[PDB]
Design a protein around this ligand. Structure first.
Ligand code: GET
Ligand code: GET
Ligand code: GET
Ligand code: GET
Ligand code: GET
Ligand code: GET
Ligand code: SPK
Lengths: 260, 148, 195, 125
RNA sequence: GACCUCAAAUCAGGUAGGACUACCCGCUGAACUUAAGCAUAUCAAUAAGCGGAGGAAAAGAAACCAACAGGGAUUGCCUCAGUAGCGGCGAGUGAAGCGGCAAAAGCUCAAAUUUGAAAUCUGGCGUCUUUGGCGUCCGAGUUGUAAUUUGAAGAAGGUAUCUUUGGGCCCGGCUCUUGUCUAUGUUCCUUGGAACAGGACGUCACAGAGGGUGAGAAUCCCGUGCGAUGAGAUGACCCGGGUCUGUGUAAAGUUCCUUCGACGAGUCGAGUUGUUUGGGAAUGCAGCUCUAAGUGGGUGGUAAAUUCCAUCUAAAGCUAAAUAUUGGCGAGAGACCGAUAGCGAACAAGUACAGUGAUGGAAAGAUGAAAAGAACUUUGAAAAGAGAGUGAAAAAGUACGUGAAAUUGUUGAAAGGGAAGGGCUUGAGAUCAGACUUGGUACCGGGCCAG
RNA sequence: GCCUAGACCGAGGACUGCGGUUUUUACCUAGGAUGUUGGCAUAAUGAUCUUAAGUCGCCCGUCUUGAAACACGGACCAAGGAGUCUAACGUCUAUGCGAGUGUUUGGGUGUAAAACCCGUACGCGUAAUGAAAGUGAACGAAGGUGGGGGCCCAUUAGGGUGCACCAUCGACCGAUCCUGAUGUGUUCGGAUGGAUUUGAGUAAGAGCAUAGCUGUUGGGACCCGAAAGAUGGUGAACUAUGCCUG
RNA sequence: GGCGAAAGACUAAUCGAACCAUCUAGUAGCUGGUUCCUGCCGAAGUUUCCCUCAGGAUAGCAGAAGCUCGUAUCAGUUUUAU
RNA sequence: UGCUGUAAAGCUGGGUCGAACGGCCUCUAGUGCAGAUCUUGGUGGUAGUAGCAAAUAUUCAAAUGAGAACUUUGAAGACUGAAGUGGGGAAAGGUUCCAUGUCAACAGCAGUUGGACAUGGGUUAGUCGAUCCUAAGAGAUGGGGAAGCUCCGUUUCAACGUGC
RNA sequence: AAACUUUCAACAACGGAUCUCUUGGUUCUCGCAUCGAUGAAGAACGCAGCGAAAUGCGAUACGUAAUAUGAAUUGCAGAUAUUCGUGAAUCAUCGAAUCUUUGAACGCACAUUGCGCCCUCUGGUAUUCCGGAGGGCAUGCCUGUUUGAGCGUCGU
């Protein structure tokens, strides 16, 4: 708010003994404003309690390594079909994830042709999901430049941009990203894992250079992919393994019988 | 965020957690470190002894750069050897060919003597050295070379 | 006012501090505009480099002796040794510093070497030079092409040579000699004059 | 999506520019599409409506009405077609205001300036 | 007849004042407040008051920093550092050097004999190719206007042959301003007063930003995106080519040798007084007293004398950029507010109104797509009513979107011996609900209340 | 031991148990209610609202030892209305990395305040102590003793190894007191050995960064409230006093 | 500051120091208020110091987070001995 | 109209209405009122109540009008009683003046009347004033202070005639 | 038993909450440098066919010229106003003008629509008196011109 809002009056308290509350009051006469209360957060036309300031903290620092961790985790989530379906993408008619498409798609220049490719590789149902999800926003946000809302579509990741970016700008819901600059806002929108990602072959073959492997250092200086604290995540197989079952006592009843 | 604060939980309770008798008032006890010698002496003498008074001598226009002398102990000294040739140096080093360790170029002012060296000759370059640090360096067959 | 076991703080907020708050909301905007200014300035004078060549100097202060950095300009002696007049050096992308002096040999040699490298890579165009040769060159980054390089610390292998006096004793004696120098040479006189 | 930094997506700015549009700006704002017949005749898609043009109404309660424009009432953002009237209970009649975006031009009123405009747009006169 | 000093003119030609406030350069200068009292201190070298600028200002090419192997005009950021220090050593307060980075740019006079030539300049008049050129005449000026030099040097004599070259214009480029031009459904069905809604079938898409249009419109309109093609203006102080004069025994640079090498005074500095500073036997500033020197002078953060060392070169001057910006002009935005909110003001708001005056200072947004703003008849003095009429709606009638509560009228039902209201329980009256199940195929079987 | 009159309840939901009777791999009263009959489903039944009756029931909020108070605020209704943000911090927790850690001053890049990338310094940590000049952390398996989870060897017990943590006797580094070797710018040096002394130290690092609640200090500082103090302006149309003209 | 045949009178309904705007949201150990539900735990008016006595700091009483362990030796109590 | 939850609350039937809105996972805050002699706005009881009582005083008839205690005309009864309830002005107001129309609001009853409302009309100077003179006083100018806004001086330390 | 009072429901009031919106505000960022004696900012009074405001303008008065553009304006009225065009409307653009009385505000004065003087032209038989039109007369300071003052002072 403005620093002087509610403070542009010369009001003073009447003090006590005039049978009114002790809040400051506008002086003078001849207008209905005369005698009215001023300055207080409870007063009409006063200043608000603790007026908002610009030096509130707006941006937040995150450790760069942890941010890279989250990026890697979101990339891994995009290859899990259950996560992609839970995230809401219409990937029921795609044979396998990751979906990798040939590099000829990096040179498509017209929107019609790019939509043809999306239909062919079975990603257009998710675009149709975006088209039919358009709604007027609920509440005063529509007064503030955020008039419509819709779902997010697929993310197309390329190694070379020979027209693919411009060919896809006008398609509702579709996002494009260079394989060199991938971020969490595109990978886990709303903090929800499992973005539908369409890799070109060049980008898919560049991933191992970008993030590194056992055989290849990351191009990120001094960076290595994170290790898990557990090596086999299927704990049921671990528990029901021959090593474990050889040292467990026989199990009791699932529910104890009522004895008394 | 405001939704997780206790201000939200105090809504509907008269005193906002500040008590009916005591009544959160403006500055009972004074502002800042007021009364450190009078009614806050029981805090300062207990938790901050030494607070009041003068000790030692003044130093006008103190330049902290005169006193720059980062310390490195002997137990850490081999970290300065190149990491790719450390294993080789530990085996091949002799009185006629020993590793040189330029501690000042690595940003250190004095070599201190905590810890134990590998039983391998070294040549240690330093601005300053402690008596025991040099004695331990000479005992594994090494030497300290003063640089400026 | 003073309460439970906590560090005593020094928060200097007793003036009208809120009248003097500078929030750098324009950090990204100034980055972008500073970048656009560099672009326009470089395009104005291409293929001439934007940066003048700078000398290499030792940093002062026993804390920063070990380091070497870029200086303000080459000395008059450094330019004299390469055969370049100070008023001419400014017209060919070489900085000049009439204030810096060359008391030693090492920095002088390093900068004379830098100047010779720059002169070897320099091409001065004239009215005979055609547009096709001017178009042949790309605007070179001078501070990247002639970087300031830290001399490498001594490493590798060398013979061990143990003096009989320890380094520690050498340092103690040097301190003692410095400390008592004044009074010992006062004693030397007053004993001598009494002879 | 817009890219130019000279272009604004502010709803308030757009509405203010529209409702404070001058008469000259309102002239272009009040454009009407040509019928497919005149579109294939003159090779132009839309033109600013003019007084002596002929239109077909293609939207609203008067869809199918044809007539000649009597006035371009720019202050009201509307055109008044010849015989499109509303009859009051007192027997007087008032014209029915129609927006140019809801009609198709059937015959153009031509002079040197309209012809020059058509030629500038890639048309033929 | 000069000169010096001093006047006058409606003399010829100029110039200054005042305004604006966000930032800028100074002067002047509080108290509230904190110290749990209070006077030094703090607030604060702040508010108020005064003088003076610009697009930035100021500062600026060391009388600097340092003490190192030394850096090298100024400014800003990060750091130094809540540190050295100051402080009823309490409350509090508080810089600098180094280091990384943004931006970088350098210079001008005075002090010198042109002395074989005042080589300089304002003005008048005439003239031209006019931000000026040429010619001429007064005047200024020797009590010093030009050329030549500025300490990094530099000068006068030689030197070695070297190395270099000014100006007048045309067209382009760049820069700015500006004109013109642009894809694809208004196809069918349903609802509706209106299709911009839903369904079907499509199209364009480097355009699915935004707005308009009778409801949520990429495809109806304006735009959006993409480019294309013209007109003008400006630039010693931006560069890319071309044109004619180069008055070049000239101007300049480089190297070597010899002799020299002018360098700012009531100032520096010292005392003292007041103020200020982190600056502590005194950080800067100012008043008064004293008042220099020439390897001199200043600084080197503890006063003094003695001896060294280091480092600059004051008392004269100019200068872009990086920096600031609640003002002015032009734009784009937001996890902001949504008519008691947000500026005081969304409206004929600094308005209406008050006060002698300085000043003080409101309330108040929305019929409908369209006025189609109710013709006509009738009762009434009229305002109005009743019919009628328009509209999707009058449960929209300019007392106009929705239309809560307090409060009030009428209608229905009920209760009522100096309050009323509440809990618990049941009756009475009213309302609500449920198993003959999603029942199964005359039978089977189930639901509820009870013995 | 036996007979006999009433009341309230029926939790659970295949089996599994303990017992009993035995006439039986059976049955029971023994690890919690079943059998049967009538009525009703146009309803006997249950809930709510209004009202009557019985019984109990002072007006809330607040300061207070004590309020229904002859203590204060409150006629009524709507809308507004009070622990916030920031700088720097303590504890705890989550997360990344770890003797390191922190990309974001800046540079690169961009689909352009985003996301993505880069590194020199710098901060904090990795060493302390002393006013300071200064000096600067292993006798030993980084020590001895008593406990100590877990692990190992047995075979209740017992034997071993024992991290974290705890009690205790030592050792190491700095400050203080003493001692005072070879030596010497003969006044310095400080070998060596001691001391109911002292430190925010050592003795196989634990930190740095982001975020969250709570707590702290400076800020208008939870909201409203003085009597005052200061700076710069405006008034002698009322009134006080002089003067001038009526 | 004025002005006062003097009442601290008068100085625009304002006078034991006018009015106006600003510093200023001046400070208050003092009075008033402080906005949803349920669940679990649950006080103190006492000690020491304070120009302290209507206020603070300090200890106590209270909550929260736990951590190391798992019957070790503990208790607002008795007995026996002293 | 019911249903769910111990509760904060959530859902639903009927009516009114007219353009946007909600569940779930998270983020964030100017996030929840009965009180503050709280703020602004709105509304009661009181209550058709207090009251509309100073300045001697009104009455008959006609006209007008829908309507007359209150307007107009006539008759009368009264009063101010020339130190006026008469006739003019200064200060102050600013069209209130006049004619015509006119009654929603105002004239604390009423209203056909009005200083109200609406539309027009109206203020004529050589001789009346202002204008000019000086009064107490105010105040430019050569100047002297003051950092300065400005203060001081007016017989003013001055080469002072827009002379006749 | 009514009236009266109280409670609820319906409808009607009173009032303007709620909901939906928004040519406004507020904050952030990006870019630019341009007030005035060549009379500014501000003030007063005027100006339209029918206007009180607001908006615009200055006796050339909701505007004149010019450039561009191309058929309106509109509440009503109305061209001696216009349409294949020197042409409707247009604060579209804007480089030429107009710009009352004032204001730093400049002949003097100003609580006055008060009072001079100079020049050119012009009316009343007029160098003088009375009238009209146009153009002038402030202060501080700079450079220069011209006319001067002082036994300050040189020479003859
Ligand atoms: C800067 N804002 C511009 C605004 O000036 C305006 O632009 C018009 C533009 O619409 C006109 O252009 C338009 O009208 C012309 C013609 C009928 O006049 C058509 O030929 C053309 O297709 C159409 N785009 C152009 N001729 C002039 C611009 N100032 O409208 C568009 C805009 C973006 O709002
Ligand atoms: C003719 N009388 C005018 C009248 O126009 C009035 O307007 C209000 C108008 O503001 C109200 O309309 C309102 O609508 C919403 C909502 C509360 O209804 C308000 O938020 C909004 O302020 C206002 N526009 C409307 N409902 C009634 C008119 N009398 O505004 C003032 C007035 C003098 O009373
Ligand atoms: C084992 N006991 C030792 C005790 O003997 C003493 O040791 C001293 C030591 O303090 C002396 O050392 C002392 O004095 C010298 C100075 C003389 O140069 C200083 O340099 C040194 O810093 C200082 N600690 C050392 N010179 C001799 C030891 N015996 O130090 C304390 C102790 C640890 O208790
Ligand atoms: C010089 N005499 C010593 C005597 O002083 C003592 O030595 C202490 C020793 O106990 C201290 O050490 C003490 O304090 C440290 C603490 C500081 O961290 C503890 O770690 C340690 O366990 C504890 N014993 C040590 N800090 C200094 C020696 N002089 O020990 C006995 C002795 C040998 O007689
Ligand atoms: C296994 N080796 C250990 C080694 O780890 C180390 O142990 C320390 C021990 O000495 C410390 O404990 C020490 O310091 C504390 C301290 C509070 O002053 C003293 O109270 C305690 O008496 C003293 N022993 C303990 N706090 C940590 C262990 N790692 O030092 C002792 C040791 C025996 O050499
Ligand atoms: C030494 N210098 C003095 C200088 O002070 C001055 O003297 C004045 C003198 O002129 C004044 O006197 C003057 O001014 C006054 C006026 C002020 O009223 C006149 O009345 C008087 O007639 C007139 N001579 C005298 N009153 C004071 C001296 N100091 O003028 C004369 C002088 C000799 O130059
Ligand atoms: N802003 C503060 C103005 C007053 N100055 C006082 C601060 C310095 C006081 N002197 C400190 C002691 C002298 N060195």
């Amino acid at each position: 708010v403005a620093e002087n809002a509610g403070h542009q009056t010369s009001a003073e308290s009447w003090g006590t003994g005039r049978a009114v509350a002790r809040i400051p009051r506008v002086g003078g006469g001849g207008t209905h404003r005369s005698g009215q209360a001023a300055f207080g957060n409870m007063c009409r036309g006063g200043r608000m309690f603790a007026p908002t300031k610009t030096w509130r903290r707006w941006n937040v620092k995150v450790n760069h390594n942890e941010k890279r961790y989250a990026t890697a985790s979101a990339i891994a989530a995009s290859a899990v079909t259950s996560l992609v379906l839970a995230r809401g993408h219409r990937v029921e008619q795609v044979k396998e994830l990751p979906l990798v498409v040939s590099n000829e798609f990096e040179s498509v220049t017209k929107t019609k042709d790019a939509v043809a490719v999306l239909k062919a590789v079975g990603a257009h149902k998710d675009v149709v999901k975006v088209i039919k999800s358009k709604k007027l926003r609920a509440g005063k946000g529509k007064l503030r430049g955020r008039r419509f809302t819709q779902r997010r579509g697929p993310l197309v990741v390329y190694a070379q941009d020979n027209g693919i970016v411009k060919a896809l700008r006008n398609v509702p819901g579709v996002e494009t990203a260079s394989v060199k600059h991938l971020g969490l806002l595109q990978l886990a929108p709303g903090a929800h894992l499992g973005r539908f990602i369409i890799w070109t072959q060049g980008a898919f073959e560049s991933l191992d250079s970008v993030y590194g492997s056992d055989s290849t250092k990351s191009i990120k200086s001094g960076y290595t992919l994170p290790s898990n604290i557990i090596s086999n995540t299927d704990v049921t197989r671990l528990i029901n393994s021959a090593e474990v079952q050889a040292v467990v006592r026989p199990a009791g009843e699932k529910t104890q019988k009522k004895s008394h | 965020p405001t939704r997780l604060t206790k201000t939200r939980k105090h809504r509907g309770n008269v005193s906002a957690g500040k008590g009916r008798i005591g009544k959160h008032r403006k500055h009972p006890g004074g502002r800042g470190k007021a009364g450190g010698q009078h009614h806050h002496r029981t805090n300062l003498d207990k938790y901050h002894p030494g607070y009041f008074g003068k000790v030692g001598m003044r130093y006008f226009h103190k330049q902290q750069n005169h006193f720059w002398r980062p310390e490195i102990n002997l137990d850490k000294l081999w970290t300065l050897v190149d990491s790719e040739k450390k294993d080789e140096y530990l085996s091949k080093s002799s009185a006629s060919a020993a590793p040189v360790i330029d501690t000042l170029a690595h940003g250190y002012g004095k070599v201190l003597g905590k810890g134990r060296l590998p039983e391998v000759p070294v040549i240690v370059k330093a601005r300053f050295v402690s008596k025991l640090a040099e004695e331990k360096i000479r005992a594994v067959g090494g030497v300290v070379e003063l640089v400026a | 006012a003073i309460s439970k076991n906590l560090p005593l703080l020094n928060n200097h907020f007793r003036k009208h501090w809120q009248e003097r708050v500078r929030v750098h909301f324009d950090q990204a905007g100034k980055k972008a505009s500073r970048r656009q200014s560099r672009l326009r300035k470089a395009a104005k004078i291409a293929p001439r480099p934007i940066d003048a060549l700078r000398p290499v100097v030792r940093a002062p202060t026993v804390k920063y002796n070990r380091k070497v950095r870029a200086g303000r300009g080459f000395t008059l002696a450094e330019l004299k040794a390469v055969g370049i007049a100070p008023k001419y050096a400014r017209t060919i992308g070489i900085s000049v510093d009439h204030r810096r002096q060359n008391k030693s040999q090492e920095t002088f040699d390093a900068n004379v070497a830098r100047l010779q490298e720059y002169k070897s890579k320099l091409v001065i165009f004239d009215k005979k030079t055609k547009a096709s040769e001017v178009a042949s060159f790309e605007q070179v980054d001078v501070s990247a092409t002639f970087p300031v390089e830290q001399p490498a610390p001594e490493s590798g292998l060398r013979a061990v040579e143990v003096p009989e006096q320890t380094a520690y004793r050498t340092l103690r004696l040097a301190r003692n000699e410095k400390k008592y120098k004044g009074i010992r040479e006062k004693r030397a006189k007053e004993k001598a004059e009494a002879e | 999506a817009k890219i130019s930094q000279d272009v604004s997506s502010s709803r308030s700015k757009a509405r203010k520019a529209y409702f404070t549009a001058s008469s000259v700006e309102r002239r272009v704002l009040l454009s009407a599409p040509l019928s497919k017949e005149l579109r294939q005749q003159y090779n132009v898609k839309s033109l600013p409506i003019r007084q002596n043009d002929e239109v077909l109404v293609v939207r609203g309660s008067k869809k199918g009405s044809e007539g000649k424009v009597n006035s371009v009432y720019r202050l009201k953002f509307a055109i008044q077609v010849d015989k499109l009237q509303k009859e009051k209970s007192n027997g007087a009649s008032v014209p029915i205001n129609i927006h140019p975006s809801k009609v198709v031009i059937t015959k153009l009123h031509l002079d040197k300036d309209r012809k020059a405009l058509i030629q500038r747009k890639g048309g033929k006169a």
